[PDB]
Amino acid sequence: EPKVNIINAQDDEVELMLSDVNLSLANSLRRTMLAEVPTLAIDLVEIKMNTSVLADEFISHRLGLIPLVSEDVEEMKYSRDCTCEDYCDECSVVLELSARHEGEEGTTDVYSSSLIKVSGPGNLNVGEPVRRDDYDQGILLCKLRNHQELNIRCIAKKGIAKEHAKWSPCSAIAFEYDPHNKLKHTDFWFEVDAKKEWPDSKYATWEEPPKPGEVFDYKAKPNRFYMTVETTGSLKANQVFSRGIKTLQEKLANVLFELENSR
Amino acid sequence: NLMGKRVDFSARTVISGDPNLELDQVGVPISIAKTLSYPETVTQYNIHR
Amino acid sequence: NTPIGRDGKLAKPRQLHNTHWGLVCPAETPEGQACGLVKNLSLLSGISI
Amino acid sequence: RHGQKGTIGVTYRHEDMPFSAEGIVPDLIINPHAIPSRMTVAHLIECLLSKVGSIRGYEGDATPFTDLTVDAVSNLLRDNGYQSRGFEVMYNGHTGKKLMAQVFFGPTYYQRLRHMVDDKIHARARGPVQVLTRQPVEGRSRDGGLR
Amino acid sequence: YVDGEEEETIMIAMTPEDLQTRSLNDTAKRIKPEMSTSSHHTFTHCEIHPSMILGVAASIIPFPDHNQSPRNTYQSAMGKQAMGVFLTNYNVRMDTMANILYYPQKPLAKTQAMEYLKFRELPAGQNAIVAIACYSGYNQ
Amino acid sequence: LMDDDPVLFNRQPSLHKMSMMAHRVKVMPYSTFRLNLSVTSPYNADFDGDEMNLHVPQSEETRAELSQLCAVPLQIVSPQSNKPVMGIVQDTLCGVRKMTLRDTFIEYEQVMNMLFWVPSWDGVVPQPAILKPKPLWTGKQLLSIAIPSGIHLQRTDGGNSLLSPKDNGMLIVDGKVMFGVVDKKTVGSGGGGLIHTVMREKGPKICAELFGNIQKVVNYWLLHNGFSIGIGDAIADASTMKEITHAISSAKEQVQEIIYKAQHNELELKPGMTLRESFEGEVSRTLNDARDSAGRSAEMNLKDLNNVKQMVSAGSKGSFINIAQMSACVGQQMVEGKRIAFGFADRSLPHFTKDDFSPESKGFVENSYLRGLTPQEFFFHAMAGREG
Amino acid sequence: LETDGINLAEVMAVPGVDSSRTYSNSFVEILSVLGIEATRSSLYKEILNVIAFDGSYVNYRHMALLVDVMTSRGYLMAITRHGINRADTGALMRCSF
Amino acid sequence: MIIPVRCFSCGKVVGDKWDAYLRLLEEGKQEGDALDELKLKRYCCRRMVLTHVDLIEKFLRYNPLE
Amino acid sequence: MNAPDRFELFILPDDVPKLKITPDSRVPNCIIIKFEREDHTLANLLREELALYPDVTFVAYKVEHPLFANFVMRLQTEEGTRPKQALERACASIINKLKTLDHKFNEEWNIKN
Amino acid sequence: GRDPTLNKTVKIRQGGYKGKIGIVKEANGDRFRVELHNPNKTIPIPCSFLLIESTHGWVPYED
Amino acid sequence: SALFDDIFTVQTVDNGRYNKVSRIIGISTTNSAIKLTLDINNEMFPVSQDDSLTVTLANSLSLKSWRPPKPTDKSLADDYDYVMFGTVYKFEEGDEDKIKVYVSFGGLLMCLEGGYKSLASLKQDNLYILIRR
RNA sequence: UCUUUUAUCGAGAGGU
Ligand SMILES: [Mg+2]
Ligand SMILES: [Zn+2]
Ligand SMILES: [Zn+2]
Secondary structure (H helix, E strand, O other), rough: EEEEEEEOOOOOOEEEEEEOOOOOHHHHHHHHHHHHHOEEEEEEEEEEEEOOOOHHHHHHHHOOOOOOOOOOOOOOOOOOOOOOOOOOOOOOOOHHHHOOOOOOOOOOEEEOOOOOEEOOOOOOOOOOOOOOOOOOOOOOEEEEEEOEEEEEEEEEEEEEOOOOOOOOOOOEEEEEEOOOOOEEEEEEOOOOOOOOOOOOOOOOOOOOOOOOOOOOOOOOOOOOEEEEOOOOOOOOOOHHHHHHHHHHHHHHHHHHHHHHHOO | OOOOOOOEEEEEEOOOOOOOOOOEEEOOOOOHHHOOOOOOOOOOOOOOO | OOOOOOOOOOOOOOOOOOOHEEEEEOOOOOOOOOOOOOOEEOOOOOOOO | OOOOOOOOOOOOOOOHHOOOOOOOOOEEEHHHHHHOOOHHHHHHHHHHHHHHHHHOOOOOOOOOOOOOHHHHHHHHHHHHOOOOEEEEEOOOOOOOOOOOEEEEEEEEOOOOOOOOOHHHEEEOOOOOOOOOOOOOOOOOOOOOOOO | OOOHHHHHHOOOEHHHHHHEEEEOOOOOOOOOOOOOOOOOOOOOOOOOOOHHHOOEEEOOOOOOOOOOOOHHHHHHHHHOOOOOOOOOOOOOOOOOOOOOOOOOOOOOOOHHHHHHOOOOOOOOEEEEEEEEEEOOOOOO | OOOOOOOEEEEOOOHHHHHHHHEEEEEOOOOOEEEEHHHEEEEEEEEOOOOEEEEOOOHHHHHHHHHHHOHHHHHOOOOOOEEEEEOOOOOHHHHHHHHOOOOOEEEHHHHHHHHHOOOOOOOOOOOOOOEEEOOOOOOOHHOOOOOOOEEEEEOOOOOOOOOOOOOOOOEEEEEEEOOOOOOOOOOOOOOOOOHHHHOOOOHHHHHHHHHHHHHHHHHHHHHOOOOOOHHHHOOOOOOHHHHHHHHHHEEEHHHHHHHHHHOOOOOOOOOOOOHHHHHHHHHHHHHHHHHHHHHHHHHHHOOOHHHHHHHHHOOOOOHHHHHHHOOOOOOOEEEOOOOOOEEEOOOOOOOOOOOOOOOHOOOOOOOOOOOOOHHHHHHHHHHHHHHH | OOOOOOOHHOOOOOOOOOHHHHHHHOOOHHHHHHHOHHHHHHHHHHHHHHHHOOOOOOHHHHHHHHHHOOOOOOOOOOOOOOOOOOOOHHHHHOOOO | OOOOOOOOOOOOOOOOOOHHHHHHOOOOOOOHHHHHHOOOOHHHHHHHHOEEEEOOOHHHHHHOOO | OOOOOOHOOOOOOOOOOOEEEEEOOOOOOOEEEEEOOHHHHHHHHHHHHHOOOEEEEEEEEEOOOOOOEEEEEEEEEEEOOOOHHHHHHHHHHHHHHHHHHHHHHHHHHHHHH | OOOOOOEEEEOOOOOOOOEEEEEEEEEEEHHHEEEEEEOOOOOEHHHHHEEEEEEOOOOOOOO | OOOOOEEEEEEEEEOOOOOOOOEEEEOOOOOOEEEEEEEEEEOOOOOOOOOOOEEEEEEOOEEEEEOOOOOOOOHHHHHHEEEEEEEEEEEEEEOOOOOOEEEEEEOOEEEEEHHHHHHOOOOOOOEEEEEOO
C-alpha cells in the first residue's frame, strides 16, 4: 500500500515524497533516523605528549567530533557485550596520530587526514575518516609552531545518538505536508491580506491550488508527505533510510516478543 | 546569638520551575538528600526496611 | 567616586543633573547603596592639566 | 544584551525541539510573557536585523540616533524570500503537526554570566563549631550553617 | 575644547543638517523638534555625533533607545560579568581566577563605536538561534 | 532523606506568615530545587536567579506540628484580607482563556489524551456537542471535567441577559460551565471566585488538587496549540496613525494658546494658587488628555488576534499603558511631580533658547518606542528612570 | 469648610457651626479636648484613610487591635522606644529590643 | 579561537571551509557569493562561518615556554 | 556533580521488567500497560494504529515526567475481544507496512540511479 | 593502610566504565570506590571489575 | 418519540465576532409568536439568509461511557443533517402565554420562546436538537 | 573502633 517517489537522488542526500501512509509512521521514521542509527566514533584519547597552545580536552573534544566511515558497523558488537579485559579486537578500532614542526619559520597545520588506521577487526569497511575527493585535506585539528610535538593514541567505539550528539549520522531533515493549506490545521497572521504576505513553499506546484468556490470537506487526513535527508559522509542516505526502517522493525519485534513470552 | 542564632540541618540552593508536581511538593537533589539525614526508631513495624 | 556618604538618604546628590550632558554617562551606574554616586566618564571627555 | 536575565529550566534533545519547515531547530526558546510588561522592542528589532544580516551576508549596522527604520528591514527581508515580520510555519516535534500559531524566530547575541549552581549549593549535617559560643560557623567553604 | 562652566554661555546645534533649516511626513522615522519660538537662529557650535554622550559599557547595546532606562542600567551592570577573553597571554600570566570561552563569536548587530573597544578582536558572547513560544511550560 | 517527608521551606526576607511553609519531599536529579509555579505568590519569588532554604525536622512531635499546622492547603486563604493568595499565573491562565472560548472544537483522538491526563478522572468520556456529522467536543466541557461535583457560581459582569452576546458573565451549575469565559476574575486571587468557593466547601485538599488538574489540562492543550509574540504585534495602521498624530497636533496647538494667554495677562487665576502654578497645572491636563486620547485610539483600532490584546485581555500580564506607550505617544516625563527644571540658567538643555516652554522643551516625549527617540527625549527619560 | 491650622476649642464655639460634628486630625488635641474614646475613633479613621488611599484593603480587627494598644493606659503611647520602655514588662523583653 | 568542527544547531560539518573561504576572499569575492559558492543555504551554517574570530594567530607569537 | 548518566535512557537494569501490565477496575475490560525506556516514537506509532480498529473503544498514553524514562498507556476494547490480542495484531500490521515500504523504496532506488 | 590496593592505579574491565583509568580511593570490602580519571567523579565498583597495575602489566585482584 | 417538531425560516444570521460560529434568528411559518435563537458551527452545517429548516426536539434518539457509533445501527439521526446535544439551564413561566427555554449546547446557546401548551412538555433536563435541510 | 584541624580584625567588589 505505501508508495515512494524519489525526486532527487545522489551521493549523500535524498529528496522524496512519501505518500499514502499515516502520519506518526513518517514522523517516527524521522525521529528514528535522528535518534537511532548506530554509528562509530572516537571515544577515548590517551595523550602521550602535548606542547601546543591548546588545552587537552579542547583537542579531545575536536577529535570527539570527527565523522568516520561506518558501512559495516552493523556487525561489530557493542562495548558492553565483549567478554575481554580492557579492549580486544571485536569491540573497538585503534587510531594513532603523530605530528611535529621542524624549523624556525613555518606554521604546520595538523589536519584530520593525517589520522592513520592502526588495528581494527577485519576485513570490514570501518576506521578510515571521511574524505571528500582524491586530494582534499579535510578537518583542521591543530596548528604547530617551532618545536611543538604532538603524539596521541585514540580508541573508537560504536554508539547511538542518545548517549551523545556525536554518533548522529544525519544533519537536518526537511519535512512538510499540505502546502496550499487545505486541512486548515493552521492559521496565518496578516495585516491586510493572508495571501500576499506569505512565501510559497517550493512544493506548491505538485498539488493543485484550491478553488475559491470550494466548500469545506471534513473527512480528509494528511496523506502526501515531503521529506529530504542529508548526511555528513559517515553513511550514504539510502543506507540511513534502510537501517532506520530495520531498527524500527526490530523494536516492534522486541515488544511483541515481550508480550508473547510474558504469558 | 540569642534572638537569631545559627542552626543545623539547613539547605541553601537555587530554585527552578516545574509544572508536573502537585501543590505541596518540592524537588530535592540527590546530593542534598544523601547529606541530610533523619533519626528513626527501630520498632516491630519497620525493622526489615 | 563622590564621598558624600550613605546616610541621610536625600535625593539631591544622587539624581542626574542637567549639566551632565556629555561630561558623564547618563545610564551606566551601580545599584543599591551607591546609585548616582559612582560615575563613569563619557567617551569624549578630558581632564585639564 | 537588553537586560533580560534568566536561567535554564530543562534541556530537550534535537528530535524533540519544534523543528521548522526547513529543518532548522531553535536552540533557545524564551517566553512571550516577558516582553509586554517590560517593553524591550530593541530585542525584537535586533533579532530581525540580525536575521537579514545573516541572510544577505554582512554585519548589519545598528547605530543609535540615525535613519534605519523597520519598514526597510521589512522590505529587504520580504524581497530575499521570507515572511516580512520573521514569522514561520513550525511543526511540533512530538507528533509532527502544524501549530495553530506562527513563532517569531531568529538569531540573537547571548552572553553567559559567572553565577553557577555548582558554586552555590550547600548543606550541613554536623560539622565544626566555634570556640567562643560553640555554635555553627559562618561560611560555605567550611561546612558552615545557615542563619 | 569646551568645559562645563563655559557651556552655559554657548548655543549648540544637534546635527549638521540643522545648521541650515530645511525648505517629509513619515510614520517610521521619529518626530524631530521645531524650535517653535525661533524664526532665526545663530548657532555657534555643533555636536560631532550625538551617540558620544554614552559610556563604555553602554556602547555595547544595539539600538540603546528602543528600550526603557532601567534595562540600559541592568545591561550596563551585567555587561561586566560575562565570560570571554580578557587578554591574549592567558598562558603565561598567573592570576587568581580566569574564565575562558571555547568558541567566541563576534556579534551581528554592530554599533560603530565597537570598532574602538577592540570588541571584534576579543569578543565575549555567542550568537544563538532563538525562538519565542509558550511551549511545554518549563520556560516561565 | 526519602520520599514523602515533611520539610520546612523558607525564603529570606520573610514578611507575612506565608513565607514559611512545609512541603512534601520528592527526590529528583540535577542540582536545583523545584516549585510548582502556583506557590510564587506568597514568596514574592521568581526564577531569575533567586535562592531559598530548606529546614528538616527531627523528632516526631515537630513533624506532626509541621504536617498539621504549617502545610500548604491550610494556607490558601489569607487572614490579612479574607481572600485567597494562590491562583493561576502565566501560560496556564492565558491558555485557559484561549481554551474556554466559543469557537474552539476538539476531535476525538485529542480528547482521549486530554481526559487521560487528569489524575482525578473517573472513566466516563462525556458525550460531544455535535453528534453528527462529526463528533466535536468544546473547551468548556474538557475544563468542566476538572471541577469537582456540586459547585455553584453565578456572576454578572456588565449586566448581561442570560443569552450572553459578548460571552461575559459566568454561570457554573453543578460543576458544568454553562457559559462564561474563564479568565482572571474567576480563577485568580479575587474574593468570591472559584478557589474561595471550593475552599469554603469541599475542603482544602480538593482545592489542592484543582490546581494540578487544571494546569495539566491547559498545559497539554496549549502545548498542542502554541503561542508567540512578534514585532508586527506592535504596528498599527496608517489610518489611526494620522488620527493620533492629529490629536496631538491640536493638543500642541492648544498649548500655544495657553502660553499666549499667560503672556498677555488674560488667564484666570485659580483659588489658592499663584498664576504660574495654575498655568503649569493647565498645560499638564491638556497633554495628559492627549496621551490618553491618542492611546485610546491605538488601543481600539487593534484587531482580534494581536497577541498583546490576548495577553492583556487575559489579564495575566500588562495593561493599557503598555499598548499606549508602544503604539501612540510616550508622553510626559516627571521629576518630583514638577517637570524638567532648569539646571542651566533659564533653560533646560543648551540646545534650546532661553525661556522656551513648548512641549518638547521641558520633557514631553513625542514618539513611541517602535519609531525611536531623539537625544534630548532619551536624556530626560534616563533622568526619570534614575529617579525611580 | 476645610481650613488650615488647628484650633478646636475656639472654632467649636462659633455661631453657625455645628459644634457636634467638627473634626480635626491632630489627635493630640483631640485627646486634650474630647477624651480617649474619640481619640481612638479618630486614630482608626486616620490609619484607614492612609492605607485606603491606594487601593489596598486590610480587614478590621488588626487595625482595631493596633489602635487599642496605643490608647489602653490613659494617654497616647507611640511606638518607638520612649513610649514602650516605660512599661512594667520584664527586663529581658525590653533589653532584647 | 579556532573554527569549530560540526555546526551548533544541525551538525553539518564546517571544519574544512575556512581555507577556501579565505582564499576566495583574496580573489575579491563577496561573503554572500563566497558562501553561495561553498554551498551553505541554511543561515545557521552561514552564521557559523560568517562571524568567526580567529585567535590562534595571536596565541602562537608568544615564544614557547617548553 | 549531580548528573544522570546518559546511557540510562535506553539500557535496562536487571530488576526491572521491560513491560508490566495491571488491570484497571473502575470499568471492565480495560487494562493499563507500563513501558520502560521508551518515548513518543513507539507510543505514538502504536496509538494512531490502535485508534482505528473497529473494536477498540478507548486508547491513550502519557509520559509522566520528561526527566525520567517511561510511559503509561490505557487500553479498552469491547466485550468480544481481549485487548492484548488486539495490541499484538496492531504490532504485526505495522511491521508488514514497514516491510512493504522498504521493498518499494529499494526498487525505486535501483531504477533511479 | 587497611588493604594493599588503595591509592594504586586501576583499569576497569567490566561495566559502563570499561577501559577507563582510576585510583582506588577506598576499598573497605568487596565494594571499592575508584576515582575515575576521565570525569571528576568517584564511582562504586565491585573489586572483581578491576585490573591493578603491577610489575608486569595489568593483573587482576591477585596482586 | 419526538417532543417538539416544527418548520422555521432563517431570517437574520450574525457573524461578526467569530469565524466558525454564527447566530441565527428564526420565526416560524404556520404560526408567529414562536421565536428561536440559535448558535451553530458554520463549517459543518452552513446556513444563509432566507432559508427553511426542519427542526425536531427529542429527549432520546433510540427507536453511558460514550463510544463511536457503529455503521450498522440507527436512530432518529439518520433522517437529519445536524444533531446537537444540550442541557437546560432555565425554564421561565412568565406573564401570560410566554415560555422561555434556555438550552446550552455544550457552550453554544439557544433560546426558545413560545406558548404554553406547545412547549409545556419540554421540561426535561437534557435535550437533543435535530435539524434537516 | 573510633575519631581528625579551617585564626583575627578591618576594608572593599558583588547577588536577590
Ligand atoms: Mg528574583
Ligand atoms: Zn573487547
Ligand atoms: Zn547548521
